[PDB]
């Protein structure tokens, strides 16, 4: 189909998209692409464009782990919305190669008994990493996720999610 | 489709994925990929990436037997989840080449009369191999399976599921 | 699709799969492939990998006829399950080249006036060839089939379904 | 699809299948395959493999007509079932080159005002042609179809639907 | 698909097919095929195999109109049924190159106020042309269509629909 | 439901409707109503209103037989359309009690081996009965059925399908 | 169902509704309803409420014939829209007892060879009765439909579709 | 629903209908209605109207057994078509109470190892009883069934399927 | 169903509902209801409960005409929302008996050539009668609709939609 | 529905049916009917008619248990097929009142480690009961069921499943 | 259905159920019932059983508006869950006649430019009434809403949601 | 529906059924029924028949609470299987009136992370009451749930779930 064709073509310029909610299908497809590009050429950059409401923390953490695994830099771009795990992957890009498009919106969100155990531990780790990424203190991240704090491109550079606003 | 093209292209790099729950279909498709790579080139390594909640034991042992069958080494990577047969297949990679990614989770799991006796036989055999893979006694594999013990990447290295945590 | 794509790719390596219930359409696909390989090169082996709960005797018997028809050696491998005609077809492989992988299972199974006549003929022929295949008496075969006897790899090599349990290739 | 790729490849070897009921669509498909192969090369054999419960008489007579039309030799093979029109098209192949696989079954079967008129003509014409192919008298063909007489390879060879039983 | 693939491969052989009902859909497909062929090579013959219950008069005339328009000869073949518009298009083939297969069958059939006016002239013109193609008198074409007259191959040759019976 | 209730309260007034095409289901349903009414009172009039394109002769004949079977007189009313079997059943009403509404339209329409046989039998019986109903001769019934002759309420009164045109 | 329940209760107050497009099924049920109320009490009025896009002339004309047939008075009410056959049936009420609600809108609209034939005579009839209904000349009725003339309650009283406008 | 209401209304008059393909479902419903009428008043006739293309023998035979069970007489009426089991059930009505309407037609028709066995048995039973009902030899009933013999009402009266052609009720 | 049984029983208490959108189906159902209640007892009140997003203007007006038609008073109650035509109808209630519940909200809204004219006419009439029901100039009504003004019960009372807030 | 009406009315005569495959819903319904009948008149017989392929053993056993619970005699009739649990329930009727209709057929059929446990128990138990019911030895019950032994009415009477064959 | 049959039977006991999510349909049905019961007898209590996760504030408030409207007393019963508007309507019970079942749980949940406008006003109104109903200060109601406080039956008596824990 | 009718008729006998998975719907169905029966006659016994694979605790707790609330005794009957909450409800019956049919089976089963907290309190409270019903100590209830302990009627009577086995 046209759509897939254009993505394939973009993938040949080392440009990948997160354009939906993060879940296991998407995560796998994305990690795959990252493994491919990395395998194809370890020294050229990858560009990850993001327009995503976020989703599953587990999914996003696998993606992030793959980002970290790849030797090349990964540039990230907020294209329309980076919310929760969308924000996190945006913030997780190679430092100095994180970009917000001028009207992108960055949104923070607060994301049996053993499932709660497994959830709590990785929520904490995501909060930890988000602080590392943004330079913000961990308590700033925590409160701002509770209050569903949203950002303009400008406000987001301020806060530390991105390094550039590309006019 | 894009997704399929991307997996095919990863296949050309000898990179393979267990991305969903293990069943007869996926088993057949994985085995098929292993035989393919083994036939293409006995010498080079296959890298199997795992992010699976697992499922059926026979399905799982079918993949295992194929992995053993392949003359080349299989590297296994815990990418997201490795639970039940997902874990088993991970621990089943070539000594020296089992990797956990820093935020992966390993979950051990407790997984017509003729069916009962068939299941009892593989169940037992699965414990036996798990113990072999991990270096643990059978009895600690059984008790840890009975209770649904889960592992962080760290905890998983200690136990014997993986050889390295790769960053 | 990927799946299909590796099967085609795997076909060019002379490797084929019976990965599900042997019915009429699957039997045709399979015959087609044997014919194809046979016709491509008539003296290189074909490797048939079985993981299948069997199916109709009729379709099973069609795959078998095509196996005999084909000049080359057809090597059979029990991958997961070889039940009914999956068992029959495994056992039907070129003598010496029938294999079980260590955790494969072999299941035996008891498989209008004029349909009944047809069935009776083919059912009797099937028991007769299973005997020929395994070295067993027809008596064993019928009674084992009756009680749905099943086999591990080891037990299956003993009985005569395969010639080797293979671990490393 | 894999199924289709195989038949195409098999069709490059001048091998065609009749693997289902004979309706107008299958008949058109098959007629087309014969014309293609006869146009590609009119001196080389075509191999029709038959495993089908037969079906529509006029659809069967169209295929038959196309075999007759095709300059080249058409060899036929009873692969599983050759029933009614399937049996008709088996017996209809080039004499000397009609084969039965050992466990094939050959079944004979009895196949508005104006539809009856056409069917009556066509029915008589196919009894006539069955008799000519088999060497059996016409009245033998009719009594046998009426009582659904079926054959093993052995019985089929002797009666005259086929020339050789291959192994 | 296999079926479609075969059809395209036959187009390279300048063989085309009318093998379903004649309507707007099919008519266009078939006019397009004739146009392609005449564009590919204006001098080389096109073969049209007919097996079709006919259908819409206006669709049939569009096809006929395209046939006349093609510079090259168009051989026509009665393969199954050639009924109503199916019969018209057969009889419309290049004089000398109209064929019946031995068991082919030719059927004749009688085939808001402004709609009726339109229909009346198209109907008249069809009769006129069917009279011209067969060398029969218009009266006989009308009466014969009224009474659903049908034709064996031999009867069709005698009447004028075709020039040859192929064996 | 509304409709059902209305037909059912009309059944209490001994009024029956043939308001769609005659098939085996409508047959069985009509025959039932007739039988019920007849059973309820064997000597009160039944009123059958008709607005139907007709349909199956065999079905038409079963309703006819049942009408005849019923001790009581059956009145018939061409309410909109009485075509083919619709016409026939309108004609079959008790002499003196066939009615046409002023804008009613009567249409005459001429409607395996064993199937043809049976059909030819009742076709002839149908024609014969139509003649008897209308006083017309058989050859006129056939000739008119061939050309799909139709009738206004007036034209139909003259010909013998009805006894009165009601206002 | 409630809806049917209200229509049933209304049927008891001798009130019926043309609340949709006039087709064969609707025409059937409406005739059935007239017949029933007429059978129940031939001396008492029926109130027919209209809010209809109209429809098929034949259908509307069956309804009309049935109204004429009903002995009792039928009062008509333009409730929402009376378009086409909706207008005709409105105008067809008993002179004296034809009503439009203050915001009722009345729309005129100009509504195989045998098909055309039939249509033409009933189209002529319906024009004649619209003329007689409204007391207009037939020429004006016709030209007015040509141009899709529409009427307010007041314009329609003036033109002759109705006798009163109710408030 | 109206349809269902008149059949119910008709049950009240001890009239029942066989107006479609005889299968397990239809027979279940029909056996029920017979059992209900017999339970209602055991001394009183049940009229059965047949307009059916027939179908399954077992289903047919189940209706038959219920007919036999019911203490009361069952009058059968070929209303349009009585074919195969339709024919059988018509022929099975109480002697002297089997009727055909002027234009009824009657069609005879010739209707895993364990299935074939049970089928053979019931088939034989079906021919024998048909022979008994019509007064024909088993041989004829076989031959005719074989040849799909049919019958106008008159030809049917003469063969034994029915006792009367009824014209007015 | 319970939902319908409840409404039937409310109808029997002379209580009607506008609970959904105003499409023609609904307005028909609702008119029928008012027609019935009037016919049952011309003297007793009708209580109409509104909780509706409004909808079609013709449908609106048909209901309105019917309400004017009924001799009895109709009380109107704003149960939750009364928007567009739902508001219009609310305000159409008998003077002194238009009510709002305390947390009801009233919402104003702006509600081929020949259709346009009709719409313009209904639309103008709508605005006028709404100016008259509330006591506001047509210009206030129009402008307030243009900007989707909404009202609390208190505000609705103030503006003139209603006469009482009930508790 | 007619069907339901009839079963309902048959239930008033204390006549129940097992007419499809035994499964939870049907067993539940059947138990309910037995409980109902039993509660209505604990001294008068229930007649159970069977034509069922049987089905689940647990469901069958719950029906059986309700039969034992029910204080009144429960007569059983083999109508079409009494197979597996159908056979068992038939055999389980009050001794002296089990009936076969002359063309009834009786079939015997051989009917997560925790699942196997539970099943072994109920199976053994069901053979025991079937032995007691029929007076045969348990090991003849088992071999018979093993080979799917079937029975004619006479054979069943001989074996011990029923007490009379009714005619 | 049996379920509807029970609910209506319970309606006769002036017992009603809010047993799913409060949406518009539900609120319409519940307002209807309350109204119906009020009409049937204004002097006798209504009992409202709540087992509901709540939902729409404004649907919630429609029900509440009808509750106040009804002159009779309304008992409320926290039968299982009373969350969001479920809690609210529970607490709207006629003081003294608000009950909780021993294992009931109460939950408080924090529940276009113009949608926002209306929503802010109704949220405020709800908070005001929750305070009113329970005797807590508006600030505790809000603060306790944010974090999503849940309550056992006892904690619920204590806060003011209900008056008695009924055993 | 026959199924519904039979349950309705059973309600007159004060017999109710838990014959499927316990959930929100069923729970409400069942509480409704209990509330009805109680309201109808306060002393007369309710009889609950249980054939249920359990379900959710919350739903089961609500039913339990309605039972306790219900003035009259409730008899419980283990029909085919009482598992999970099916067991609970069975065991929750009026003491001395809890029954098991002989082939019945009692199965005990283990049934925004703040859900865990709610679920923890309620798991504990079920265990408590389950302990109290049987006479087993809390800990026995836990471990026996943990390994899925199943019981025969005999085993269950002696373990405390039921008081009597009926035959």
| Residue whose C-alpha is closest to residue I7's, from J54, I20, K96 | I20
Task: With beta carbons under 8 A apart, name residues in chain I contacting G81.
Answer: 58
Closest CA to D84 of D100, D101, D65, D105: D105
Q: Where are the alpha helices (DSSP H) in E70-164?
A: 85-91, 113-134, 138-146, 153-159
For I25, list phi and psi in degrees, rounded to 5. -35, -60
Between CA E9 and CA E11 the distance in angstroms is: 5
Q: Angle C2-11/B24-40 helices, nearest 10 degrees? A: 40
Q: How far is J119 from chain H (nearest CA, A)?
A: 27
Residue A60: which of A37, A28, A33 has the closest Cα?
A: A28
D68 CA to centre of own chain: 12
D81 neighbors D152 (Cβ within 8 angstroms): no
Q: DSSP letter at J45?
A: P
Contacts made by residues K150-153, CB under 8 angstroms, sequence distance 24+: K150/K105, K150/K106, K150/K107, K150/K108, K150/L114, K150/L118, K151/K105, K151/K106, K151/K107, K151/K108, K152/K105, K152/L121, K153/K78, K153/K100, K153/K101, K153/K102, K153/K103, K153/K104, K153/K105
Placement of tokens 């028809």 in the chain: C69
Give the active site residue among J47, J52, J56, J84.
J84
Q: Which of I14, I61, I62 to mutate to test the interface with G (most CBs of G within 10 A)?
A: I62
* Cβ distance of H169 and F42 shorter than 8 Å: yes
Dihedral over alpha carbons F85, F90, F95, F101 (to 10 degrees): -160
Where in chain D does DSSP place strands (E)?
15-18, 46-52, 74-83, 98-100, 105-107, 150-151, 164-165
Q: Does L119 touch chain K (CB under 8 A)?
A: no
- The encoded tokens of residue A36 equal 């491919």
CB I62 within 8 A of CB I129: no
**What secondary structure does DSSP assign to F92-116, as a single string?**
TSPTT-EEE-TT-EEE-----HHHH
Q: What is the CATH number of domain C1-169?
A: 3.90.226.10
Chain J residues with CB under 8 Å of B113 CB are 116, 119-120
Least CB-CB distance to I114: which of G49, G104, G150? Answer: G150
Look at strands A150-151 and A105-107 and give their pairing.
antiparallel
The CA distance from L130 to L140, in Å, is: 10
- Tokens at residue L49, please? 């028949």
Instruction: Residue K14: count other Cβ atoms within 10 Å of its Cβ.
Output: 19
CB B83 within 8 A of CB B106: yes
Residues of F in contact with G61 (CB under 8 A): 80, 103
Residue in F with minimal Cα distance to G65 = F101
Backbone phi, then psi, for K19, in 5-degree steps?
A: -130, 20
Q: Which chains touch D (3 or more CB pairs under 8 A)?
A: C, E, F
Between the CA of residue A121 and those of A92, A112, B78, L151, what are the distances in Å? 19, 15, 18, 40
Q: Which residues pair with F100 in a beta bridge?
A: F78, F165
Strand partners, B105: B81
**CA distances in angstroms from G45 to B148, G8, G9, G14, G165, listed in the order given:** 80, 17, 16, 7, 19
Residues of F acting as catalytic residues: 84, 109
Do J and L make contact, counting contact as 3+ CB pairs within 8 angstroms?
yes
**Among C58, C109, C116, the residue to mutate for chain H (most H Cβ within 10 A):** C116
Output the six-digit token pair for E114. Answer: 């402004």
- C-beta atoms surrounding F48 within 10 Å: 25
CB contact under 8 Å between A112 and L116, yes or no, is: yes
Pairing of strands G150-152, G105-107: antiparallel
User: Does residue D5 belong to the interface with chain C, where contact is any CB pair within 8 Å?
Assistant: yes
Residues in chain G: 167
Q: Regarding beta strands G74-83 and G98-100, do their DSSP bridges make them parallel or antiparallel, or are they unpaired? A: parallel
Q: Is C90 helix (H, G, I), strand (E, B) or coil?
A: helix
- Residue F113 to chain D, least CA–CA distance (Å): 6
Most distant CA pair in chain G, distance = 48
What contacts B108, CB < 8 A, 6 or more positions away?
Answer: B83, B84, B87, B130, B141, B144, B145, B148, B149, B150, B151
Residues of I within 8 A of K11 (CB-CB) are 6
> DSSP secondary-structure letter at J55?
B
Q: How many CB atoms lie within 10 A of CB A164?
A: 14
Q: Does K36 touch chain I (CB under 8 A)?
A: yes
Q: Do J69 and L15 touch (CB under 8 A)?
A: no
Q: Give the whole-angstrom CA distance, residue E162 versus residue E158.
A: 8
Enumerate the H helices of K12-163 as residue ranges: 24-40, 57-69, 85-91, 113-134, 138-146, 153-159
What's the burial of A143, exposed, middle or buried (CB within 10 Å: 0-12/13-18/19+)? exposed
Residue D124 to residues D57, D131, E151, G11, L122, Cα–Cα distance (Å): 11, 11, 16, 64, 81
Tokens 């009856």 found at = D116
Helix or strand (DSSP H, E) at E99: strand E98-100
**Which other chains touch chain I, taking contact as 3+ CB pairs less than 8 Å apart?**
G, K
Q: Are A17 and A55 in contact (CB under 8 A)?
A: no
Cβ neighbours of I122 (radius 10 Å): 18
| Whether L118 contacts chain K with CB within 8 A | yes
Q: In 3D, which of A45, A43, A47, A151 has the Cα closest to residue A99? A: A47
Tell me how crowded residue D166 is: count the other CB atoms within 10 A of its CB: 14
Residue I111: closest CA among I87, I86, I91, I85: I85
> F147, F154, E119, F110: which is closest to G121 by C-alpha?
F154
Cβ of L33 within 8 Å of Cβ of K103? The answer is no
DSSP K62-104: HHHHHHHHSSS-EEEEEEEEEETHHHHHHHTSPTT-EEE-TT-
Quote the tokens at residue F137.
């001769």
Distance CA C65, CA E17 (A): 36
G114 CB near a chain E CB, below 8 Å? Answer: no
Question: Coil, strand or helix: which one is H127?
Answer: helix
Q: Beta strands of chain B (E only): which ranges?
A: 15-18, 46-52, 74-83, 98-100, 105-107, 150-151, 164-165
Q: Any CB–CB contact under 8 A between A38 and chain B?
A: no
In angstroms, rounded to a whole number, what is the distance separating the alpha carbons of residues G64 and G56? Answer: 12
Whether G9 has its CB under 8 Å from any CB of chain I: the answer is yes
Which helix (H) or strand (E) is I64 found in, with range?
A: helix I57-69
Burial, E73: exposed, middle or buried (Cβ in 10 Å; 0-12, 13-18, 19+)?
Answer: middle
Judging contact as 3 or more Cβ pairs under 8 Å, the answer for C and A is: no
Whether H113 contacts H99, CB under 8 Å: no
Pick L8's closest partner by Cβ from K5, K101, K148: K5
Using CA coordinates, name the residue in chain J closest to B111.
J112
Q: How many CA atoms within 13 Å lie on the side-chain side of I1?
A: 7
Nearest residue to A84 (alpha-carbon basis) of A112, A114, A100, A106: A106
Q: Are C66 and C132 in contact (CB under 8 A)?
A: no
Of chain H, the end-to-end C-alpha distance in Å amounts to: 28
Residue E52: closest C-alpha in chain D: D24
Half-sphere CA count of J73, side-chain side, radius 13 A? 9
Burial K135-159 (b: 16+ CB within 10 A, else e): eeeeeebbebbeeebbbbbeebbeb
- Annotated active-site residue in H84, H103, H145, H164: H84
Alpha helices per DSSP H over chain A: 2-11, 24-40, 57-69, 85-91, 113-134, 138-146, 153-159
Q: Are strands E74-83 and E105-107 parallel, antiparallel or unpaired?
A: parallel
Residues of I with a known catalytic role: 84, 109
By Cβ distance, the residue of C4, C25, C36 closest to D10 is C36
Q: Are K44 and K14 in contact (CB under 8 A)?
A: yes
- Beta carbons of B127 and B142 less than 8 angstroms apart: yes
L160–chain J Cβ distance below 8 A for any pair:
no
List C-alpha distances in Å: J46 to I15, J12, J37, J101: 49, 11, 7, 18
Q: How far is CA D146 from CA D84, D142, J8, in A?
A: 11, 6, 48
CA dihedral (F54, F59, F60, F63) in degrees, to 10, reads: -130
CA Rg value for chain J = 15
Does J49 contact H at CB distance below 8 Å? Answer: yes
Q: CA angle, B71 as apex, B66 and B74 as ends, to 5°?
A: 70
Q: Point out the catalytic residue in the list C47, C52, C56, C84.
A: C84
Per DSSP, the three-state class of C87 is helix
Chain centre to alpha carbon of residue B105: 13
CB contact under 8 A, L36 and K6: yes
Residue H55 backbone dihedrals phi, psi, to 5 degrees: 115, -160
H123 shares contact with chain J (CB less than 8 Å): no
Q: Is H136 exposed, middle or buried (0-12, 13-18, 19+ CB in 10 A)?
A: middle
Asked if J61 lies within 8 A of L80 by C-beta distance, the reply is yes
Is K101 an 8 Å CB contact of chain L? yes
**Structural domain boundaries of chain L?**
1-167
Sequence-distant (6+) residues with CB within 8 A of H32 are J3, J6, J7, J10, J17
Q: Quick check: do K and L touch, 3+ CB pairs under 8 A?
A: yes
Question: How far is I52 from L48, CA to CA, in rounded Å?
Answer: 43
C-beta separation of A110 from A133 below 8 A: no
Residue of K47, K56, K109, K145 marked catalytic: K109
Contact H123, H92 (CB under 8 A): no
CA pair distance E140, H85, nearest whole angstrom: 49
Task: Please state, in angstroms and rounded to a whole number, the distance separating the CA atoms of residues C134 and C136.
Answer: 5
Among residues K161, K116, K108, the alpha carbon closest in space to that of K136 is found at K161
Question: Is residue B3 classed exposed, middle or buried when 0-12, 13-18 and 19+ CB atoms within 10 A define those classes?
Answer: middle
Going by C-beta distance under 8 Å and a sequence separation of 6 or more, which residues neighbour residue D94? D73, D74, D75, D76
Cβ-Cβ contacts under 8 Å for F82 (sequence gap 6 or more): F50, F51, F52, F54, F89, F90, F104, F105, F106, F107, F161
Both tokens of residue L73? 């005794």
What is the token pair recorded at D98?
A: 């009609």
Rg, C-alpha atoms of chain A: 15
What's the first-to-final CA gap in chain J, in angstroms? 31
Touching check for E137 and chain D: CB below 8 Å?
Answer: no
Instruction: Give the separation between CA L42 and CA L39, rounded to whole angstroms.
Output: 6
Considering only the beta carbons, identify the residue of D7, D103, D150 that sits closest to C32: D7
Q: Give the three-state DSSP class for G47.
A: strand
Instruction: Say whether residue L167 is in contact with chain J using an 8 A CB cutoff.
Output: yes
The hierarchical CATH code for the domain A1-167 is 3.90.226.10
Chain J residues inside the 8 Å CB shell of H68: 101-102, 167
Q: Tell me the shortest Cα–Cα distance from L67 to chain J, in angstroms.
A: 21
DSSP for G94-152? Answer: PTT-EEE-TT-EEE-----HHHHHHHHHHHHHHHHHHHHHHT--HHHHHHHHHTT-EEE
Would you say E30 and E16 are in contact if contact means Cβ atoms under 8 Å apart? yes
Pairing assessment for the beta strands I164-165 and E105-107 based on DSSP bridges: unpaired
Backbone φ and ψ for H97, nearest 5 degrees, come out as: -125, 30
Q: Do H113 and C116 touch (CB under 8 A)?
A: yes
CA distance C7 to chain H (A): 36
> What is d(CA B104, CA I151) in angstroms, rounded to the nearest whole number?
55
Q: Are C74 and C67 in contact (CB under 8 A)?
A: yes
Decide: C69 and D15 in contact? Cβ < 8 Å: no
In chain G, the residue whose alpha carbon lies closest to the alpha carbon of I65 is G101
- Calculate the dihedral angle through the C-alpha atoms of F57, F59, F65, F70, rounding to the nearest 10 degrees: -140
């Amino acid at each position: 189909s046209l759509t897939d064709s254009v993505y394939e073509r973009l993938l040949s310029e080392r440009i990948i998209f997160l354009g939906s909610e993060v879940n296991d299908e998407i995560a796998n497809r994305l990690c795959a692409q990252i493994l491919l590009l990395a395998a194809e050429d370890a020294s050229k950059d990858i560009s990850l464009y993001i327009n995503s409401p976020g989703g599953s923390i587990s999914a996003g953490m696998a993606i992030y782990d793959t980002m970290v695994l790849a030797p090349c830099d990964i540039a990230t771009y907020a294209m329309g919305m980076a919310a929760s795990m969308g924000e996190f992957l945006l913030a997780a890009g190679t430092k100095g190669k994180r970009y917000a498009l001028p009207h992108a919106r960055i949104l923070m969100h607060q994301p049996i008994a053993i499932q709660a155990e497994q959830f709590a531990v990785i929520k904490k780790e995501m909060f930890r990493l988000n602080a590392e990424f943004t330079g913000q203190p961990i308590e700033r991240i925590e409160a701002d996720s509770d209050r569903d704090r949203w950002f303009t491109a400008a406000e987001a550079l301020e806060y530390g999610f991105v390094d550039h606003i590309i006019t």
